[PDB]
């Protein structure tokens, strides 16, 4: 079945609605933590709009802020199927990334490849834009990206892009640049190879 | 009180085998349905297969139907999972949940089935083609320790396999400002992994900064210091 939101940001004691595309059930999982069963069919209420089902939070404490899985039995063939998941985060103030870039080390570059990895720390909110250019190229195909989950004590995320090039590739070429793009500003953090 | 606790996963080459147990501890089968759900790393709940142990009566999701059997012994009030043929999809946390039940509720009235009230920790099934330990390269400290700021500095660890890979900062005396990054499966097929510390710029030169890499499948532990790179 499909989930609506798929994401959500809210406040705590905010009025909080995720859909779900006759009976449903709803857990609640935190990370690292197992399912825990929250209502079948407190501050958490279900519903039935037409033929999709609500699950409605009141006032949101601190300890709901976490992933929502809708659940449901089939009666043919007795099957059980899940949601692709709804995840509700702390909305928080904006925060600027702290940007920080890092050649490759040199005892990679014996072996014969270059990670080039760009760091997005302690930024708000999640949506951003990471480009590479390498001589002013921009990059495309050539690079990863991994953000962890919403800090605990912050509320913000940390990022990292990763550019991968041959060893031969990054020693042709001098100038390696990292963009950050949030809203109306960017941020771009650079190095000459060799200094 | 109740109690549910799972284990047998394990690494497990494909076309392999493996069977799990879930222990029971505070209630009765048979008034109870167990249910075998896995979580993919990073993804979501997927139901594999469930049981009701008086009865015996099975279910499985169709990815797995023909190759992995549910069973339960009534004796000890442990439920199995035995898993055969398989594939590197079938890589997960592997929870075993509870709901109530009734011969009537459940032949006729599964639609409105009371949910999966309690739910173990999880058990863990690997399925590798290669274990492959990680190679793990210094992100040397952004700053010259005049900079006079925040530095950042990191460790790479790239190019092993299977999951997971466990991180920490001066054998865990540096916790604060520490991000570990979820690992991501490179083009190689080899997963990747990044590390990273905030500290003081002027720590550095006085304060050395290691971190202490553990990949549990391949028995390897590598110990990197991250020096100022002049
Ligand atoms: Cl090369
Ligand atoms: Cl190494
Ligand atoms: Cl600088
Ligand atoms: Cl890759
Ligand atoms: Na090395
Ligand atoms: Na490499
Ligand atoms: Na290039
Ligand atoms: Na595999
Ligand atoms: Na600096
Ligand atoms: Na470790
Ligand atoms: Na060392």
């Known amino acids: 079945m499909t989930q609506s939101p798929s994401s959500l940001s809210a406040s705590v004691g905010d009025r909080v609605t995720i859909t779900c595309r006759?009976?449903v059930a709803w857990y609640q999982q935190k990370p690292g933590k197992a399912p825990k069963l929250l209502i079948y069919?407190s501050r958490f209420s279900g519903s039935r709009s037409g033929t999709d089902f609500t699950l409605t939070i009141s006032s949101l404490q601190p300890e709901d802020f976490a992933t929502y899985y809708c659940?449901?039995?089939?009666?043919?063939?007795?099957?059980?199927?899940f949601g692709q998941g709804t995840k509700v985060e702390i909305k928080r103030t904006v925060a600027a990334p702290s940007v920080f870039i890092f050649p490759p080390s040199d005892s990679q570059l014996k072996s014969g490849t270059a990670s080039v990895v760009c760091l997005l720390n302690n930024f708000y909110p999640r949506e951003a834009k990471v480009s590479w250019y390498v001589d002013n190229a921009l990059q495309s195909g050539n690079s990863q990206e991994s953000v962890t989950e919403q800090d605990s004590k912050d509320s913000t995320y940390s990022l990292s892009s990763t550019l991968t090039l041959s060893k031969a590739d990054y020693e042709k070429h001098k100038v390696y640049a990292c963009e950050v793009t949030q809203g109306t500003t960017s941020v771009t953090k650079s190095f000459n190879r060799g200094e | 009180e109740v109690q549910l606790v799972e284990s047998g996963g394990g690494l497990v080459q494909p076309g392999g085998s493996l069977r799990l147990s879930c222990a029971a501890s505070?209630?009765?089968?048979?008034?109870?349905?167990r249910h075998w759900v896995r979580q993919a790393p990073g993804k979501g709940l997927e139901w594999v297969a469930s049981?009701?142990?008086?009865?015996?009566?099975?279910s499985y999701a169709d990815s797995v139907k023909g190759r992995f059997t549910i069973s339960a012994d009534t004796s000890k009030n442990t439920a199995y999972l035995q898993m055969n043929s398989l594939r590197a999809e079938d890589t997960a946390v592997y929870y075993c949940?509870?709901?109530?039940?009734?011969?009537?509720?459940?032949?006729?009235?599964?639609?409105?089935?009371?949910?999966?009230?309690?739910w173990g920790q999880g058990t863990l099934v690997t399925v590798f083609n290669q274990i492959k330990g990680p190679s793990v390269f210094p992100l040397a400290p952004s700053s010259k320790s005049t900079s006079g700021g925040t530095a950042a500095l990191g460790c790479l660890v790239k190019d092993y396999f299977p999951e997971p890979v466990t991180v920490s900062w001066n054998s865990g005396a540096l916790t604060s400002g520490v991000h570990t990054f979820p690992a991501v499966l490179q083009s190689s097929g080899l997963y990747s992994l990044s590390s990273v510390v905030t500290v003081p710029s002027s720590s550095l030169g006085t304060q050395t900064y290691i971190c202490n890499v553990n990949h549990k499948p391949s028995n390897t532990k590598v110990d990197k210091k991250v020096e100022p790179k002049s």
């Open positions: 949940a509870r709901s109530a039940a009734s011969y009537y509720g459940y032949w006729h009235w599964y639609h409105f089935s009371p949910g999966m009230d309690y």
């Open positions: 505070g209630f009765d089968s048979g008034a109870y349905l």
């Open positions: 049981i009701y142990p008086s009865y015996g009566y099975t």
């Open positions: 006759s009976a």
């Open positions: 069919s």
């Open positions: 659940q449901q039995y089939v009666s043919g063939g007795w099957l059980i199927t």
